[PDB]
Amino acid sequence: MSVHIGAEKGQIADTVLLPGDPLRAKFIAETYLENVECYNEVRGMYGFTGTYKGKKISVQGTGMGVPSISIYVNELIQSYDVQNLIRVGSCGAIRKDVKVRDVILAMTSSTDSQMNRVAFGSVDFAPCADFELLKNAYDAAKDKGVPVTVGSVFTADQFYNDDSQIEKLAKYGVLGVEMETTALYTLAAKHGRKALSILTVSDHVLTGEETTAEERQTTFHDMIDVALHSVS
Amino acid sequence: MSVHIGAEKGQIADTVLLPGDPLRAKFIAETYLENVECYNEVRGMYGFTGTYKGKKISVQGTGMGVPSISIYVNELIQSYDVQNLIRVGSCGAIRKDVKVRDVILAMTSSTDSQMNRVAFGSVDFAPCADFELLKNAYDAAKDKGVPVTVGSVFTADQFYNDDSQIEKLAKYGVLGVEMETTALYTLAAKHGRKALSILTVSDHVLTGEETTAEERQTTFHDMIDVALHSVS
Amino acid sequence: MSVHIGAEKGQIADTVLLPGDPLRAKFIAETYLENVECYNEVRGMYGFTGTYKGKKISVQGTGMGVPSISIYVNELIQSYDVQNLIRVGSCGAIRKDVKVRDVILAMTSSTDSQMNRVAFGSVDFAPCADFELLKNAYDAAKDKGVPVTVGSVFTADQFYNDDSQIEKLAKYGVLGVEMETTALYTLAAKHGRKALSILTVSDHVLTGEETTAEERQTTFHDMIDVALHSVS
Amino acid sequence: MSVHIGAEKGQIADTVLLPGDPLRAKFIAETYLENVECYNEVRGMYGFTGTYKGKKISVQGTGMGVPSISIYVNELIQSYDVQNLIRVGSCGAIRKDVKVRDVILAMTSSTDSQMNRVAFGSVDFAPCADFELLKNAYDAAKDKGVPVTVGSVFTADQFYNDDSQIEKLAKYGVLGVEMETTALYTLAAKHGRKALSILTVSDHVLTGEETTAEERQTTFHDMIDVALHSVS
Amino acid sequence: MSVHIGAEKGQIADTVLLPGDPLRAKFIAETYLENVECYNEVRGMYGFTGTYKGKKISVQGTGMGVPSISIYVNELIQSYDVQNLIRVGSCGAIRKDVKVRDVILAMTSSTDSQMNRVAFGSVDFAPCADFELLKNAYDAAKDKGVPVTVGSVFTADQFYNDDSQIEKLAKYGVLGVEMETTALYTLAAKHGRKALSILTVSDHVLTGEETTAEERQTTFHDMIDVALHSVS
Amino acid sequence: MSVHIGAEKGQIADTVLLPGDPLRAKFIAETYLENVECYNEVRGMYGFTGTYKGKKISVQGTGMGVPSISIYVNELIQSYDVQNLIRVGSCGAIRKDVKVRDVILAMTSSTDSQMNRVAFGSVDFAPCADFELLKNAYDAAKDKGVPVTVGSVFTADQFYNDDSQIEKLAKYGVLGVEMETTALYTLAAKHGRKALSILTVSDHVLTGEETTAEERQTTFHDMIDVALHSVS
Ligand SMILES: Nc1nc(Cl)c2ncn([C@@H]3O[C@H](CO)[C@@H](O)[C@H]3O)c2n1
Ligand SMILES: Nc1nc(Cl)c2ncn([C@@H]3O[C@H](CO)[C@@H](O)[C@H]3O)c2n1
Ligand SMILES: Nc1nc(Cl)c2ncn([C@@H]3O[C@H](CO)[C@@H](O)[C@H]3O)c2n1
Ligand SMILES: Nc1nc(Cl)c2ncn([C@@H]3O[C@H](CO)[C@@H](O)[C@H]3O)c2n1
Ligand SMILES: Nc1nc(Cl)c2ncn([C@@H]3O[C@H](CO)[C@@H](O)[C@H]3O)c2n1
Ligand SMILES: Nc1nc(Cl)c2ncn([C@@H]3O[C@H](CO)[C@@H](O)[C@H]3O)c2n1
Ligand SMILES: [Cl-]
Ligand SMILES: [Cl-]
Ligand SMILES: [Cl-]
Ligand SMILES: [Cl-]
Ligand SMILES: [Cl-]
Ligand SMILES: [Cl-]
């Protein structure tokens, strides 16, 4: 019904989790939700709806980069009237004080995408998490004792950047680099919806060290748990 | 000892409240604090130290605009090793859903100042409140039932702007316009300190309606109360 | 072996066709090539190698937008030493003189992506097709009588753009809008490889008219045919 | 009557001297003028009117930085119909050929403020002194033998600038750095008024040497003398 | 009849060759064309019409830099309805693989001129050669065995550039630097005309070596020959 | 000896007048100077040396636009050690208060050229006339009663500008539009030389009215007279 999502009216829940990898969308749905339906296979960018403790929850792959997620966020909001949009992904830590097991909640994101300069010109637009979701996610992490850090991230257009400024960004307190948050937070606010990015650490970019498969399995699972207690 | 602040080592507290108007600095000190000393009269930009429930607290006028507050924030951090910097001021609401009695906590701020473009060039740097202070301020407002809203603001260089984009900013969910937050949050993060702006409503810019003297007296006083419970 | 592509040394051919949709990668491989192997399933972003008239040819999904294709182009070049990179996709025509059955060969592309401003600053970098591939593709279209048009396209970051300048772009002779070419041509030239985008018409953006399923099936097939005669 | 200035119709003279420090406004009024009245105490940003050789002259503190002076200049022009606006302040010399006792007359100023980029976009707007005032000020300096230099200055947003380009500016002949002139000259020309900045040397920025208290007392006094003979 | 060209209706041919130097315009006309008339002497910027193998052909000096050629291109198009515009000039090679005897055909050009940023703002506009002329010129070079290279060039505003980025441009595959192509290709496309730049090598900029008088005489003559077989 | 000027050491005087049109260079030399020699015919961009009241004076065509004059100014300064550079040209008046017979002295110029953004990035560089020459030229106009106006001009890259902002420029007090001053003043200051542009009115751009041949003959002649009394 919308150009990129093959779902009919009603198949998509009010609350959508937004991994980048459509195979993580599948994984998440199969593993966390009951009564799972796949409402979309267009471009292999899987989307699913199921229930979690009796409440409908969709999970939708976004792809990588601002332009890709923008497509999905726009259609979810405009065509399916989605209300709560929660990115669940990873980022490369760019400070030593950001630990491999920390679950990051982005208040805001910096970017080298031109998307906001296209709309505002000489204004630096700072995108903003919905506080209600942020606080809930934070409270849920605390209540369970999941280590959680709250700050900003950098939304990059180039995974491989020869002109990378992450070193300067780190000195300004920025926590990590990823490629979607700016778009999510900007598009959700523009349409009066609620958005939050929750992120795990894929690696430390300035030391090059990977997080281990085990560490990744655990922070991933913590991230999903926190996500599922962020609405209300 | 520092170019713009006539204080000696030790006169300035770890925690500084940052009104714009140096006469509000005076007012605040005289009204809220015990054992008040004025440590600075340079340029009439008054700064004071006193105690509040047994703890030293300074209050320092910043002046108006990014360049003015930047001067004071930099010297407080670099010369006096100040740790917690809390702007207490007002802003013009730019949305109807922001009410005349709301106390605003800025997660972040947009800007038309070039300060961050000078440092980063093709990066939109999004400044970030320290979450710890934000959360405390929020908790203190809640515990007392002070109405509080948490979102972003716009830091403007021009009070009188013929090319004002506040209308587009409002559609993106931005709450109000003021002239200091971007600088405060950027400079504090750059040096590893903690910053928060707490703001009341001076008026609704897109309707032109002033907030009354009574409304102003009350939200002002609420703002100070919340500020004094934001550290720890 | 490379972060985003699960292939081992040698599985990927010298020449790679680059659809956006990984399901079109599959379709193309199954339909056009003999002895097909799938060398990648990471993120569902399928990549395949097979033969066409005795020569190895890979087909690799890129995803949507500059940041997504940049990832794949960079890894194909740097990790697998790929030599010829040919985008095969569609674009929305933005001029009436660009006909629904035309196969477009992009000499160059305009963009609102910041990727090149990040590297060059005050330079407008104009990306360039490899002429050798362009000419071959052109010759192959001509020899068969496939209608073909040679000009520029616009690489957009935002599919849904409220600040879209396509109308001005059309007056300057630009043929259509898509979301990958700038990245492909910039990254290939930077590493001394050969790149070409060949595009069909998904619709006319300024009239809103879709191209029919039949038209799409035919120009698609023409596009693949032209692609398979572009190397040498 | 105007938001930032507590004066009634008529209290403010046609000609206003514009120090940054409101305590220098006081000093100047008390020391140079007869029959002095203070028409403004709002924010401690003192403004005064008195007479000098029988003619009314006001002196008004501007604060520091483009945003602060812009507020005062705009209200003086729009609310009080002020005609002649003369900045009297200091600047840090950035060339050795600019001597500690030179009184600078700014023909124009460069800037890293975005104020003009906000209004003009891709135009570098060069602000311009009113020549009539400049020439008078120059003639008065010459007639008395006050050493005077006529050139450009740099209006900076950041007193403490990690990305300071003053070294390149100095090679282009720029004389010194301050924080108000661009705003003064731009706002005055926009409304058909006459503006001039007259500046003394606070220090040499690229050698770090302060000007002595004695030197400062003398060039200050010369600056005021020249200012008082610039109208007509 | 047009501000800068003293020609009457009809004196200027459909096809105009565009050297920079008006003395090369003369040279070309006298040497290559029969029945030569000079239709313009305004500013010494000579323009001529003659015939070549029975067809009228004009040759018009453009001067140096985007602003100068823009004047001539605009008047030729708007006042004299010129259809085919072919720059014939030189450029400084910026890569070793571009040989002193190569005749360059510019598909496109990069630039540090602001002309396109003035019109498009946050869009990098990539100007495009008319393919029909390019292909003809290419075919004519091939048929005769004239060595020919097809790629991009850089249109510079500053012959003497202290901030020259040609080194980065060379790594991205850019062939050489000149000062007109961007304007020619942008203005011709904007008005639906056909444009091509054909260029010889004046020198290698990154090695400093001049091309010899003999080399220059030969590539020049090859360039004219190719130009005269580019229409149709 | 320099790439664009065919003169030998010593042929060029300390003081050079800089018309745009090389035929006006000729005219000026033949009409105003004794013992005239032509030292340059390269590109028809004539340059001449003669004497005026016993002092050597050169006159050198610059061509049109920042890139063209930049070439000539750079070579005159670097190769021939020229000290005083005086543009003598015209501009289109953009305000009614600028009269057809006024001789304009540019203190400074705005621009849409990127030349200064290329060197300074986020700085608006304001070019500055040499005051000594300006004052002399002014004094000479006054002593003779030649009407003279002193302010700023706009240096445009595009004579035919669809995105012309001259209307906004006029409201900010800018006097007229031309195409060279920014380059002259920037390049002269960068090398420690003295520069001035003196300009007559070619027309009123916002009313379209031409200045008559008679008016042009007279202001032209006044301009030359003022130029010849600007050194010392
Ligand atoms: N630039 C970047 N860098 C690092 Cl170290 C990342 N770790 C995870 N991501 C996320 O993974 C994808 C890129 O592999 C993007 O969706 C991005 O949001 C990362 N993106
Ligand atoms: N632009 C602007 N607009 C409105 Cl409606 C304001 N209300 C309060 N402020 C604060 O008041 C001062 C300006 O009067 C600035 O410090 C600013 O931060 C405001 N600033
Ligand atoms: N902006 C945009 N617009 C139109 Cl009308 C398109 N038609 C096809 N594409 C391609 O399709 C994807 C978006 O659906 C992108 O990969 C893009 O390159 C288009 N992209
Ligand atoms: N950046 C800067 N630098 C130096 Cl070395 C200065 N000397 C005086 N000022 C003026 O003093 C104030 C800053 O202390 C500003 O009003 C500014 O205009 C200076 N501003
Ligand atoms: N920047 C530049 N550099 C080099 Cl090495 C050149 N060789 C020839 N030209 C052409 O020659 C003139 C400059 O001499 C310009 O028209 C330009 O297009 C060159 N322009
Ligand atoms: N844009 C522009 N406009 C007007 Cl109304 C002009 N009148 C004279 N000139 C000068 O004349 C030449 C353009 O004809 C340029 O050298 C320019 O400096 C003008 N340039
Ligand atoms: Cl992710
Ligand atoms: Cl305030
Ligand atoms: Cl596609
Ligand atoms: Cl000052
Ligand atoms: Cl040339
Ligand atoms: Cl001229």
Tab-separated table of C-alpha atoms in Angstrom, chain D:
chain	number	residue	atom	x	y	z
D	1	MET	CA	9.388	51.335	26.301
D	2	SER	CA	11.715	49.052	24.272
D	3	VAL	CA	12.299	45.548	25.679
D	4	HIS	CA	15.911	46.115	26.849
D	5	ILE	CA	16.141	49.884	27.433
D	6	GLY	CA	14.062	51.525	30.204
D	7	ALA	CA	14.059	55.024	28.650
D	8	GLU	CA	11.055	57.160	27.698
D	9	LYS	CA	10.623	59.120	24.474
D	10	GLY	CA	13.300	61.838	24.267
D	11	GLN	CA	15.787	60.710	26.940
D	12	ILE	CA	18.206	59.358	24.323
D	13	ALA	CA	20.289	61.691	22.159
D	14	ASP	CA	20.770	61.564	18.333
D	15	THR	CA	24.369	60.496	18.878
D	16	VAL	CA	25.236	57.515	21.057
D	17	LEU	CA	28.681	56.315	22.086
D	18	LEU	CA	28.855	52.561	22.416
D	19	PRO	CA	31.359	51.079	24.873
D	20	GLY	CA	30.946	47.378	25.653
D	21	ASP	CA	31.361	47.660	29.432
D	22	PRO	CA	28.435	49.450	31.092
D	23	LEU	CA	30.898	50.681	33.797
D	24	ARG	CA	32.890	52.435	31.053
D	25	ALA	CA	29.612	54.014	29.919
D	26	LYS	CA	29.257	55.434	33.470
D	27	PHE	CA	32.909	56.460	33.602
D	28	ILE	CA	32.670	58.249	30.243
D	29	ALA	CA	29.441	60.098	31.134
D	30	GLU	CA	30.646	61.233	34.598
D	31	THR	CA	34.015	62.284	33.253
D	32	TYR	CA	33.195	63.948	29.907
D	33	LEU	CA	29.639	65.218	30.085
D	34	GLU	CA	27.690	67.913	31.977
D	35	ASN	CA	24.157	67.549	33.393
D	36	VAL	CA	24.247	63.757	33.312
D	37	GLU	CA	21.100	61.641	33.566
D	38	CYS	CA	20.943	57.858	33.717
D	39	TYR	CA	18.017	56.780	31.487
D	40	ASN	CA	18.585	52.997	31.871
D	41	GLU	CA	19.419	50.427	34.519
D	42	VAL	CA	17.734	47.381	32.939
D	43	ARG	CA	20.175	44.454	33.296
D	44	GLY	CA	22.812	46.833	34.732
D	45	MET	CA	23.488	47.796	31.128
D	46	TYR	CA	23.766	51.470	31.956
D	47	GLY	CA	22.870	54.227	29.533
D	48	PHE	CA	23.362	57.943	30.121
D	49	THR	CA	22.626	61.295	28.526
D	50	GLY	CA	24.494	64.521	29.169
D	51	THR	CA	25.943	67.378	27.198
D	52	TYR	CA	29.323	68.045	25.687
D	53	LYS	CA	30.071	71.617	24.626
D	54	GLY	CA	26.303	72.298	24.674
D	55	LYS	CA	25.156	69.272	22.618
D	56	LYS	CA	23.245	66.257	23.945
D	57	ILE	CA	25.232	62.943	23.670
D	58	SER	CA	24.202	59.548	25.081
D	59	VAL	CA	26.513	56.731	26.079
D	60	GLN	CA	25.140	53.196	26.155
D	61	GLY	CA	26.724	49.915	27.164
D	62	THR	CA	26.356	47.214	24.512
D	63	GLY	CA	27.685	44.122	26.233
D	64	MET	CA	30.033	41.672	24.465
D	65	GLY	CA	29.495	39.899	21.140
D	66	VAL	CA	27.341	40.428	18.060
D	67	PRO	CA	24.083	39.172	19.637
D	68	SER	CA	24.352	41.553	22.628
D	69	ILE	CA	25.185	44.767	20.751
D	70	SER	CA	22.579	43.850	18.074
D	71	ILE	CA	19.897	44.033	20.704
D	72	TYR	CA	20.972	47.565	21.784
D	73	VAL	CA	21.649	48.907	18.322
D	74	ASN	CA	18.256	47.680	17.050
D	75	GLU	CA	16.310	49.238	19.935
D	76	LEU	CA	18.251	52.527	19.806
D	77	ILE	CA	17.520	52.835	16.076
D	78	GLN	CA	13.909	51.517	15.983
D	79	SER	CA	12.545	52.793	19.329
D	80	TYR	CA	14.618	55.987	19.863
D	81	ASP	CA	15.397	57.045	16.294
D	82	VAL	CA	19.123	57.357	17.057
D	83	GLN	CA	21.100	58.700	14.066
D	84	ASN	CA	24.806	58.380	14.855
D	85	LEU	CA	26.206	55.276	16.518
D	86	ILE	CA	29.818	55.211	17.550
D	87	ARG	CA	31.428	52.214	19.068
D	88	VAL	CA	34.265	53.101	21.400
D	89	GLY	CA	36.109	50.020	22.561
D	90	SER	CA	39.280	48.002	22.273
D	91	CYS	CA	40.664	45.214	20.193
D	92	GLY	CA	43.661	42.851	20.314
D	93	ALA	CA	46.213	43.924	17.693
D	94	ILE	CA	47.176	41.079	15.388
D	95	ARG	CA	50.018	42.832	13.479
D	96	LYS	CA	53.334	44.297	14.757
D	97	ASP	CA	52.844	47.412	12.607
D	98	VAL	CA	49.789	48.232	14.735
D	99	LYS	CA	51.246	50.104	17.676
D	100	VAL	CA	50.054	50.112	21.280
D	101	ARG	CA	49.151	53.856	21.061
D	102	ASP	CA	47.307	53.747	17.722
D	103	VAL	CA	43.665	54.691	17.609
D	104	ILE	CA	41.954	52.478	15.053
D	105	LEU	CA	39.137	53.552	12.725
D	106	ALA	CA	37.432	50.510	11.146
D	107	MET	CA	36.455	50.980	7.523
D	108	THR	CA	35.038	47.477	7.619
D	109	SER	CA	35.155	44.158	9.486
D	110	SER	CA	35.519	40.482	8.714
D	111	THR	CA	33.670	37.983	10.877
D	112	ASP	CA	33.009	34.366	11.839
D	113	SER	CA	29.526	35.319	13.008
D	114	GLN	CA	26.780	33.745	10.918
D	115	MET	CA	24.564	36.783	11.132
D	116	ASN	CA	25.185	37.864	7.582
D	117	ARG	CA	25.208	34.326	6.105
D	118	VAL	CA	21.744	33.911	7.720
D	119	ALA	CA	20.461	36.951	5.720
D	120	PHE	CA	22.474	36.555	2.470
D	121	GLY	CA	23.475	32.878	2.213
D	122	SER	CA	26.116	32.569	-0.494
D	123	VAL	CA	27.084	36.275	-0.322
D	124	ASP	CA	30.016	37.535	1.772
D	125	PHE	CA	28.500	40.815	3.011
D	126	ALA	CA	31.155	43.428	3.770
D	127	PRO	CA	29.802	45.921	6.377
D	128	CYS	CA	30.885	49.549	5.830
D	129	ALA	CA	31.611	52.475	8.213
D	130	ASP	CA	29.764	55.680	7.432
D	131	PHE	CA	32.444	57.697	5.620
D	132	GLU	CA	31.298	61.051	6.909
D	133	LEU	CA	31.845	59.975	10.550
D	134	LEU	CA	35.058	58.183	9.650
D	135	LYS	CA	36.509	61.219	7.911
D	136	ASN	CA	35.486	63.557	10.773
D	137	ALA	CA	37.006	61.254	13.368
D	138	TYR	CA	40.144	61.020	11.201
D	139	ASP	CA	40.332	64.849	10.729
D	140	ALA	CA	39.906	65.414	14.474
D	141	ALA	CA	42.721	62.926	15.234
D	142	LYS	CA	45.004	64.614	12.656
D	143	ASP	CA	44.219	68.188	13.809
D	144	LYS	CA	45.318	67.185	17.323
D	145	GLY	CA	48.180	64.845	16.192
D	146	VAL	CA	46.629	61.711	17.764
D	147	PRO	CA	48.200	58.741	15.932
D	148	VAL	CA	45.438	57.094	13.987
D	149	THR	CA	45.283	54.028	11.654
D	150	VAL	CA	42.545	53.302	9.200
D	151	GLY	CA	41.729	49.747	8.128
D	152	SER	CA	39.746	46.642	8.922
D	153	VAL	CA	39.138	44.528	12.012
D	154	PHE	CA	37.846	41.065	12.720
D	155	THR	CA	34.625	40.585	14.607
D	156	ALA	CA	34.939	37.214	16.449
D	157	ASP	CA	32.217	35.160	18.178
D	158	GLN	CA	34.750	33.357	20.346
D	159	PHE	CA	37.201	35.225	22.642
D	160	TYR	CA	38.732	31.786	23.340
D	161	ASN	CA	38.966	30.231	19.881
D	162	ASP	CA	40.729	26.857	19.323
D	163	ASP	CA	40.129	27.296	15.548
D	164	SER	CA	41.316	30.916	15.435
D	165	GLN	CA	42.360	32.094	11.937
D	166	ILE	CA	43.763	35.429	13.116
D	167	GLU	CA	47.137	34.479	11.683
D	168	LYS	CA	45.777	34.216	8.170
D	169	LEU	CA	43.716	37.424	8.779
D	170	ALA	CA	46.883	39.339	9.771
D	171	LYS	CA	48.620	38.391	6.484
D	172	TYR	CA	45.633	39.879	4.658
D	173	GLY	CA	46.234	43.179	6.415
D	174	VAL	CA	43.541	42.904	9.105
D	175	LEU	CA	44.465	45.096	12.100
D	176	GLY	CA	42.877	43.519	15.174
D	177	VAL	CA	40.167	41.346	16.727
D	178	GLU	CA	37.089	42.460	18.668
D	179	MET	CA	33.490	41.263	18.902
D	180	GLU	CA	30.909	43.934	17.913
D	181	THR	CA	31.788	45.959	14.803
D	182	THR	CA	30.181	43.705	12.167
D	183	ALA	CA	26.845	43.921	13.953
D	184	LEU	CA	27.042	47.666	14.513
D	185	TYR	CA	27.908	48.458	10.884
D	186	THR	CA	25.437	45.970	9.408
D	187	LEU	CA	22.449	47.030	11.516
D	188	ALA	CA	23.106	50.765	11.099
D	189	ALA	CA	23.376	50.575	7.299
D	190	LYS	CA	20.222	48.390	7.073
D	191	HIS	CA	18.241	51.227	8.695
D	192	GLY	CA	19.943	54.219	7.014
D	193	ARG	CA	21.875	55.372	10.099
D	194	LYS	CA	25.558	56.328	10.495
D	195	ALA	CA	28.019	54.096	12.303
D	196	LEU	CA	31.716	54.073	13.192
D	197	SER	CA	33.883	51.932	15.495
D	198	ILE	CA	36.872	53.590	17.096
D	199	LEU	CA	39.208	51.191	18.866
D	200	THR	CA	42.290	51.138	21.098
D	201	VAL	CA	44.712	48.236	21.583
D	202	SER	CA	44.105	45.989	24.599
D	203	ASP	CA	47.142	43.784	23.697
D	204	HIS	CA	49.052	42.096	20.866
D	205	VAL	CA	47.419	38.692	20.488
D	206	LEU	CA	50.168	36.989	18.495
D	207	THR	CA	52.897	38.138	20.920
D	208	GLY	CA	50.660	37.946	24.100
D	209	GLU	CA	51.964	41.278	25.496
D	210	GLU	CA	49.427	43.373	27.436
D	211	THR	CA	49.225	47.092	26.919
D	212	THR	CA	50.126	48.780	30.276
D	213	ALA	CA	47.539	50.542	32.512
D	214	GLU	CA	49.134	53.860	31.528
D	215	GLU	CA	49.005	53.197	27.780
D	216	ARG	CA	45.359	52.081	28.207
D	217	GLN	CA	44.413	55.248	30.146
D	218	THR	CA	45.871	57.459	27.416
D	219	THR	CA	44.536	55.758	24.243
D	220	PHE	CA	41.197	55.448	25.950
D	221	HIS	CA	41.079	59.186	26.595
D	222	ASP	CA	42.271	59.904	23.008
D	223	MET	CA	39.518	57.627	21.722
D	224	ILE	CA	36.819	59.525	23.637
D	225	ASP	CA	38.229	62.875	22.427
D	226	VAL	CA	38.130	61.701	18.804
D	227	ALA	CA	34.614	60.295	19.255
D	228	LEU	CA	33.320	63.650	20.580
D	229	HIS	CA	34.429	65.347	17.313
D	230	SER	CA	32.991	62.862	14.795
D	231	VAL	CA	29.446	64.232	14.319
D	232	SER	CA	29.007	67.012	11.655
